[PDB]
Amino acid sequence: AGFTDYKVADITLAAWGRRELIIAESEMPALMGLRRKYAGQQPLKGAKILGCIHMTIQTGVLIETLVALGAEVRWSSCNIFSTQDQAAAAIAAAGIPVFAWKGETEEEYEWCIEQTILKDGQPWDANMVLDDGGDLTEILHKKYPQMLERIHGITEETTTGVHRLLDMLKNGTLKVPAINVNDSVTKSKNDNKYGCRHSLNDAIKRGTDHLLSGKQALVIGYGDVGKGSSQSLRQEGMIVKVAEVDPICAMQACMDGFEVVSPYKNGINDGTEASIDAALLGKIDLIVTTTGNVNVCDANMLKALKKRAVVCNIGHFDNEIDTAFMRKNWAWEEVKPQVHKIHRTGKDGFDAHNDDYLILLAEGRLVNLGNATGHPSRIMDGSFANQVLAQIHLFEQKYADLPAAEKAKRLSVEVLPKKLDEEVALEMVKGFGGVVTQLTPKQAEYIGVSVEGPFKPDTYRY
Amino acid sequence: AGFTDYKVADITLAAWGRRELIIAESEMPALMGLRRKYAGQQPLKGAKILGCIHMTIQTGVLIETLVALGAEVRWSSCNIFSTQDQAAAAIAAAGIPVFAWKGETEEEYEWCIEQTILKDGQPWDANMVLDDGGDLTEILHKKYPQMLERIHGITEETTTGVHRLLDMLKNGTLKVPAINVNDSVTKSKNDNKYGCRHSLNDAIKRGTDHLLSGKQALVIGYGDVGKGSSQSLRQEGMIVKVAEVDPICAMQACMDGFEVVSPYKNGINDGTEASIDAALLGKIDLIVTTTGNVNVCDANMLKALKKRAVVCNIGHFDNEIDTAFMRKNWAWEEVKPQVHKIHRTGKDGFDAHNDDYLILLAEGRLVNLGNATGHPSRIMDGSFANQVLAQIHLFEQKYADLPAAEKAKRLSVEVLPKKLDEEVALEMVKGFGGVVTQLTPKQAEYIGVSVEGPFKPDTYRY
Amino acid sequence: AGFTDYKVADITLAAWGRRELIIAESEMPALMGLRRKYAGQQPLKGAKILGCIHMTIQTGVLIETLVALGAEVRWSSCNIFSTQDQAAAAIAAAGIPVFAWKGETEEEYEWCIEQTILKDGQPWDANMVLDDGGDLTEILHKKYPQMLERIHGITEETTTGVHRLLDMLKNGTLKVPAINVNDSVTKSKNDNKYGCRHSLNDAIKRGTDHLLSGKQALVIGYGDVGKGSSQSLRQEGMIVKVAEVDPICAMQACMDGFEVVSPYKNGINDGTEASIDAALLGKIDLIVTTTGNVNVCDANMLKALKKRAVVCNIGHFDNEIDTAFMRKNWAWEEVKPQVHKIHRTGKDGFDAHNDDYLILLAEGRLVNLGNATGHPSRIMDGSFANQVLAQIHLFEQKYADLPAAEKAKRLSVEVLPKKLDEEVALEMVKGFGGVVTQLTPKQAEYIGVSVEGPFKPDTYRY
Amino acid sequence: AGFTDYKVADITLAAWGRRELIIAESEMPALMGLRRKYAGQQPLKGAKILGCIHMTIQTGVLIETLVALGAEVRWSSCNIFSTQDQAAAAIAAAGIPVFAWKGETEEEYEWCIEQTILKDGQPWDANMVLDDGGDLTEILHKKYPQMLERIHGITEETTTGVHRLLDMLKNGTLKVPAINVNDSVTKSKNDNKYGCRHSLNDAIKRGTDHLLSGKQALVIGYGDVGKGSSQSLRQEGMIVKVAEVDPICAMQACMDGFEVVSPYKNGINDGTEASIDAALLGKIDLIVTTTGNVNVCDANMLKALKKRAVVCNIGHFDNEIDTAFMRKNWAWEEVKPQVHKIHRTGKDGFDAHNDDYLILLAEGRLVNLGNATGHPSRIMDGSFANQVLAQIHLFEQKYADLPAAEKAKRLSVEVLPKKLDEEVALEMVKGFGGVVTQLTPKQAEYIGVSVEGPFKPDTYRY
Ligand SMILES: NC(=O)c1ccc[n+]([C@@H]2O[C@H](COP(=O)([O-])OP(=O)(O)OC[C@H]3O[C@@H](n4cnc5c(N)ncnc54)[C@H](O)[C@@H]3O)[C@@H](O)[C@H]2O)c1
Ligand SMILES: NC(=O)c1ccc[n+]([C@@H]2O[C@H](COP(=O)([O-])OP(=O)(O)OC[C@H]3O[C@@H](n4cnc5c(N)ncnc54)[C@H](O)[C@@H]3O)[C@@H](O)[C@H]2O)c1
Ligand SMILES: NC(=O)c1ccc[n+]([C@@H]2O[C@H](COP(=O)([O-])OP(=O)(O)OC[C@H]3O[C@@H](n4cnc5c(N)ncnc54)[C@H](O)[C@@H]3O)[C@@H](O)[C@H]2O)c1
Ligand SMILES: NC(=O)c1ccc[n+]([C@@H]2O[C@H](COP(=O)([O-])OP(=O)(O)OC[C@H]3O[C@@H](n4cnc5c(N)ncnc54)[C@H](O)[C@@H]3O)[C@@H](O)[C@H]2O)c1
Ligand SMILES: Nc1ncnc2[nH]cnc12
Ligand SMILES: Nc1ncnc2[nH]cnc12
Ligand SMILES: [K+]
Ligand SMILES: [K+]
Ligand SMILES: [K+]
Ligand SMILES: [K+]
């Protein structure tokens, strides 16, 4: 009962967090099916996992699934605003080291990751990594390279983090093999698209309580997150316009019934105020960045936006919006946590009744997790069942224990095989009460598949 | 001008067809852009293309683009009901050999393909093949192998035809290389999905004029065609249920807001009447097959359907529905072309006032093309720009002229490169008036792409 | 068998029309329930009904219901393009006088109405009137006032016709009592709104085969027809803008997720070209008029529309669009019946390849009936069950047989009582397989209604 | 300033509340337009308003508009869970008597109303009443008749309160005239419908964070609230079924694309368990009551619901659900405020891991206000502009000062005139940036209206 190896906002929130974990378990059949399937086998016995992912109720169910399969863990959040304090409390109260609270400073964010890496002031004997966005992976490679000599693999959650892993692999700087969890269909579709459909409008309502119907939105990007975000707004009755640099994604937006526009005249972002389509931006009530890119809602765009427009970002990092420009030039009036009016009158105080402001959500950080609770349990079930399978695979592979010759042929970034992707999906469908049909032998022969799958070639896009 | 090398329903429909071709050209900017870009170069000069694809207005613009780039062609439809007679007439009146009419018998269908293959009773000097579904490809391999010796390639339109090509490649029986046109994103995720969204409800309305809002539909399959078909019906207000054998596609259906059901109890299709979920099928007003598989709307399902339900197929071939069972056992009352009441009372004549019938559309053949006009020009623009690019590529490669050892290195089924897919998409977006944004050099570096694209890795699923 | 008292396009279409009538009966449970309920009673024995309403399959079922209840009728269509020739043929072949074909001239339209009014060159002994739009009503009042001395009532179908009846009543020129069928909920909602949702996109697809998704629409008006029309387009993925003069209707459009715009700068229609919002009109691909008003798509709007935009009208009369201006100034190229390219280059012939044209559907007449088949049977069931009830009521009232004192207290325009409106709706719900719940006595007492209804006060708006 | 005449949860929330009021003012152009138009005239100078309506931010803007026009007020909430504590704090900190907090007991709820009625232990000098649901109106009639002698009128917000007023009028017990604010179009067809569309899914997400897409809902009722509620869930991807006793509303549900079902076999609610459609209720994941009626989600329905279904009510009063049965028989586990697991195992404690529970939101009280923030400011703008106009009208009429014979002529429940309804709507449309078109004199004559409106007859249903 003398557990002290944690730091959370308020340990007394634990009972509430535990009640929400018990509900979440009932919403996560793929993940809880893995718990039941592998509990006796203990496939993660001896695993010591450094985890860095949004400390939500859903991540709590992931953590306790890893522990139930035999692992020890040390946990932090991968964003300063995404922790649910009741989830962090419930995990700490169960005797699991977690360093996470909603509303960390940047210094506290780094300190939290460091508290997972170090145990009693010395490097923990970690041997597995679970990451979301690549921050823990980067810190280990830059600051604790000796620890990577003992680590069998990294399982990376998100599009931005995979990009960072691939840059390291191309540069010969990745030191351990990784699984790209993002690119399972039961992750990328379910989480990146459907999760944002549920949680974007949720976060905007909680932050502002604004009517969305009848108002004008601009969604920057139309990848998986942009697709789900645009739907989140369109289904509420917003008039949604979409920006894109990828003409295939822009084609999908047109065919999906959106008008495709650019913030810049003729799409040319030459850096001048003259290039901004001021007429377009002057009619926009809400802008949402979804790109994983840098400065896609720039200073000149922010200057041109309609008065009282809402500005938010649902991509991984806040630099999608030039919030640095806003910090330098405009006065911030906090409405409530994660909601700020940015007064474009200047930086020297503000007029509480000034009409020329923007509303920035979550200080430009991931808005669904910052102003609401991120994706719902039944969606995160897919992503996190993938994470568990990937942790099992890399931990059983034992890369750190292999001779150097075996290591060279295994230093890669891989995806989960389609058969496992299908098995996760089947458990998700059953959670809805859906009934999948079984092919007859003649039908399986006719289309050239096994009755048990996989049902599509690896090239299939769904 | 003394041209007689054609067979169509009614040559006097040519002027109407030509008016619709001129409209369609204005709806097909990618295809007409290729005409403008390549007309001076004449990249298909010397090409002699056997074409087998639905003889619609959209196919007319494809044909005339190939001719405009230097090709000569001989053309037939790939389905007995999909020709638009005014399109066939306009092509024949332009001096282009075409053998196609709406409402062919099976014998006439085979004769029409044979009239493209033979000219003046002897093999035409063909050197290229454009196919949709693989029927012409199969006839050439089985009956005209000497002609394949001089053919440089096949460009195949559709999922079913690609499967047939891959079976041949794996068995060592494919004799010329092929391009899988289906799997461009501007084909598969445009034509297969959005095309069916436009044209399924269109065909049902033309065939029956039934209100769809408030009625119950069952869509068999949730691949690209099943996704577009379900949306076609849901957007009209149908209550849509979806069946699937692929749990990933079933998961998408659930997350897209559909109830996932099986015609069989617990999904087990064991051939007994007892396996049919009679309560489910007894409530269905419309069943649509979308699978490319065999007997997915089987005899026992047809016996169990609600009285007066509509039965149709939008997959390539009619054997998705057991129409043979219906021909053997039940009396067919033609309402009008491509609309039959199937009287479940028996086969010995019918009672015009019997209440126990099903309405079968297009005798189970592709319903969008059989009962309406298939996909609209602005969607087919994508598929057919891909076709032209693929014809240019295989014709310029000149496989038939290669030595045996070089043929061996090039005998493959390939897809178009992503850069070309993006260039097609860009023209389509411009056709909507969409404006694609250009990355700055810093943004392109940040995400690791060229400013000119491609913007996604080949693994990206959109 | 010597029946000659009719004029239709082609009597040989009768068997096809009869097959479609038999299907339509199965889609019209309220109307066929009235047939079964009242057949023995013959409540319309002795009725001699002049009917003027779109001679569609649905009107055929109405006609034969009146006849089955004892009436004699003489029928014409209320629009030159709305007849379905197979329906007119089936009615004529059954021995019922009908004068109607698709594609009448204005002179033929008037001649057809006159052939119902006259029998053997003399006024028919008509005693009831069923009208849609008020043309027959107007002709009787202006040209055959003596016939109105024998007529017990008029049952008027549509919003425009009711307006005309109310003007006559206010002016003391209406000569017989009328029932406003339009304002039953089972008419106005079902027909005016839902019918247009089904049939507007249907007609545009049949006329043009244009992709609608991703394109820009302007719907003029947001009453019942404008609401249904906007939904017909939005559900196809159009980007729909709405114009209105009624701020309450405009508020609904905003809340329904549409941008509300005016063709005129600041909404001020001063008659000058300068007042046109040329930037707005230059981006519109489709304009649909829904108002029942005059010149809502005027000459200056037509001049400013985007090249190749589609122009159509779904209100009752063609004068919603200034087609007279187009006839005077621009060359018309017929694509096919009810589809014309209007070449804005001038009136002296046209260039078949000119890019500066508009596509006008149905020459500006009701587009759903002109280019498709109007509303579906299951929707028209509501409107036409109301018509039958209203004919029974007015015929049984016997206004023409009353003393002058009784006539004065009965010269009114009335609606059907709510209890009958509910009974029609119940039969419609049952046709969908819907199950209405029965209030318990305690619940009925709690909300202050009878268990049998009516369930709402007459002020309720639904 | 020494003000103590209030009771709120926490006065230190005032500054947050004031920030949200200032935002809400920018979202409420009709209400703020009334403030600007009437501030100089002071039409409510001398008004002393007892107000009983949900103490939200939106109600704060209403209160301060009344005060800005000259009124003094004493305020309470009309529901124990609907107060936003920061709104109550901001109003109290402005020196306005308010007695309201989120989470009142029933005794506290009654005490709060009593603190508005009494000032310093004696009747306040009230002369106007603003009510939502009729509780304050009932207390005044039953317990404070002498106070009603000096009250000029009641302005009643909601359907349930209007029903109570009409019952009193019919029984001869209503003592002062009333305005039915509910039945303005800018109230009923804005607040009742669109408000629930925004706020129902909002409350469910905040209370449970459940994914809604792909799950089964049953909405009891399809009036204004039921229509908006069904849309709230359907737009999230729920499979929504609708129950109704009114066949017209049921017909609308069918035509809007919903399956219409009854909890009872054949719709017969005879009080036996055998009458429950157990198969139907066993598949429902969420039930929402919308009726204003009693016991529409009864004890037998609650016993039959699928395990872990969510149960909630968005009608005015909690007796739509038999929560009394649940309090008597089943154990309640509080998850967090306004979220309880109802364990169907029995009442003698509960098992935290029991799978057989229902999730009840807001203890069966109005869920949008109990678990979220009710309707958004831009929707409440309409309702509350109507409230202000109604207060001005009844206060200026001065009923309490009239002689008995004149009171008799004015004792009524009336609605606001259409012209005012349109003027409210126009301000709302301008708030979206919408542009209403002005009729030309010829067009106004053609349809029989004034250029200034009203544009529709009083019978028009929108
Ligand atoms: N908040 C969440 O819950 C959540 C969930 C999943 C992923 N993410 C993050 O969201 C981001 C996007 O992820 P994704 O999976 O959608 O990636 P994606 O690659 O599928 O899509 C990003 C899109 O942005 C477009 N884009 C890039 N630069 C642009 C610019 N300047 N203007 C317009 N469009 C531009 C690209 O063309 C691409 O289609 C990543 O940072 C990812 O880590 C967040
Ligand atoms: N009519 C058209 O215009 C049109 C357009 C494109 C393609 N097609 C044809 O439609 C068919 C489908 O093409 P696609 O691109 O959608 O292929 P696809 O592979 O994307 O989808 C077919 C789906 O059917 C499912 N399926 C197979 N057997 C099943 C069964 N017994 N029950 C339920 N689901 C089952 C598969 O799991 C798969 O997801 C092919 O024949 C293709 O050639 C028609
Ligand atoms: N084609 C069909 O099947 C069909 C069906 C029903 C009715 N109708 C006809 O459609 C028309 C409309 O009927 P409705 O029932 O919708 O009537 P409605 O009164 O409910 O709606 C007409 C709307 O037009 C608006 N309007 C008038 N002038 C306008 C202008 N200049 N600009 C913009 N908006 C303007 C009005 O404000 C009103 O809301 C009538 O002519 C009716 O007879 C046609
Ligand atoms: N929560 C909110 O923000 C909010 C907003 C407006 C009104 N309300 C309240 O919601 C309730 C409904 O208001 P409304 O304006 O929609 O009223 P309404 O009269 O328009 O609709 C109620 C509907 O319930 C139906 N109904 C009655 N008993 C039924 C039963 N046993 N089963 C099924 N259907 C049944 C009626 O037929 C009717 O159509 C009222 O109590 C009102 O005060 C709440
Ligand atoms: N609820 C959630 N938990 C963890 N990671 C997430 N990413 C998005 N939503 C999430
Ligand atoms: N199908 C139809 N028949 C008759 N009148 C109509 N009005 C609209 N559609 C109609
Ligand atoms: K969550
Ligand atoms: K077509
Ligand atoms: K029809
Ligand atoms: K609110």
Side-chain angles (χ1 to χ4, degrees), chain A residues 163 167 183-186 188-190 193-194 197 222-224 227 242-257 260-270 291-296 317 319 378-379 418 421-423 425-426 428-429 432-440 442-448 455-456 458-462, chain B residues 163 167 183-186 188-190 193-194 197 222-224 227 242-257 260-270 291-296 317 319 378-379 418 421-423 425-426 428-429 432-440 442-448 455-456 458-462:
Chain A
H163 179 69
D167 288 338
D183 281 344
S184 285
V185 186
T186 53
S188 55
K189 288 292 202 173
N190 177 36
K193 186 160 56 183
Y194 302 136
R197 178 191 171 191
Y222 205 73
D224 288 328
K227 284 171 174 74
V242 168
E244 249 296 349
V245 299
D246 183 324
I248 295 175
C249 294
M251 177 273 302
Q252 296 179 293
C254 298
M255 291 289 181
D256 289 343
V260 167
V261 303
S262 180
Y264 311 101
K265 299 174 183 167
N266 307 129
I268 303 300
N269 181 352
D270 67 5
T291 66
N293 207 340
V294 60
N295 212 22
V296 308
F317 281 126
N319 64 345
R378 194 170 292 277
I379 283 176
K418 182 170 301 300
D421 202 5
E422 291 179 350
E423 292 169 10
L426 182 59
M428 299 182 74
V429 171
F432 292 95
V435 179
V436 172
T437 298
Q438 182 181 95
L439 288 161
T440 66
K442 281 179 174 175
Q443 287 174 331
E445 182 187 42
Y446 189 86
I447 64 172
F455 303 98
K456 299 289 186 300
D458 284 336
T459 55
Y460 191 74
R461 295 194 175 94
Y462 308 83
Chain B
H163 176 70
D167 282 351
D183 276 323
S184 293
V185 187
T186 52
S188 58
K189 304 196 76 145
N190 164 39
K193 185 158 61 178
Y194 300 130
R197 177 194 180 185
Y222 206 72
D224 290 328
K227 286 175 175 70
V242 172
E244 253 291 352
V245 303
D246 182 325
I248 298 177
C249 296
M251 175 200 72
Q252 294 183 289
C254 296
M255 294 287 183
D256 289 341
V260 169
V261 302
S262 181
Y264 311 101
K265 298 175 181 167
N266 311 126
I268 299 177
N269 180 3
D270 73 359
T291 66
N293 207 339
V294 60
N295 204 24
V296 308
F317 282 124
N319 61 348
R378 192 168 294 274
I379 280 174
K418 181 168 299 303
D421 205 359
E422 291 177 350
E423 293 173 3
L426 180 63
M428 297 179 70
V429 173
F432 291 100
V435 177
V436 172
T437 298
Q438 176 187 91
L439 290 162
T440 65
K442 169 155 174 266
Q443 287 171 333
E445 180 178 353
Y446 188 88
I447 64 170
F455 301 100
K456 301 288 188 299
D458 286 337
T459 54
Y460 191 75
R461 295 192 175 94
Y462 307 86

Side-chain angles (χ1 to χ4, degrees), chain B residues 198-265:
Chain B
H198 175 100
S199 61
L200 175 58
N201 71 52
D202 190 12
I204 295 164
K205 288 183 189 172
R206 298 190 198 204
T208 69
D209 293 293
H210 276 356
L211 178 64
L212 305 179
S213 310
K215 299 187 181 167
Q216 300 277 327
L218 176 57
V219 176
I220 308 295
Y222 206 72
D224 290 328
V225 170
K227 286 175 175 70
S229 293
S230 298
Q231 177 64 20
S232 199
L233 303 179
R234 186 246 300 277
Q235 74 192 33
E236 289 276 332
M238 301 205 83
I239 294 84
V240 181
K241 293 168 180 52
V242 172
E244 253 291 352
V245 303
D246 182 325
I248 298 177
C249 296
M251 175 200 72
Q252 294 183 289
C254 296
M255 294 287 183
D256 289 341
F258 297 109
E259 185 174 353
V260 169
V261 302
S262 181
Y264 311 101
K265 298 175 181 167

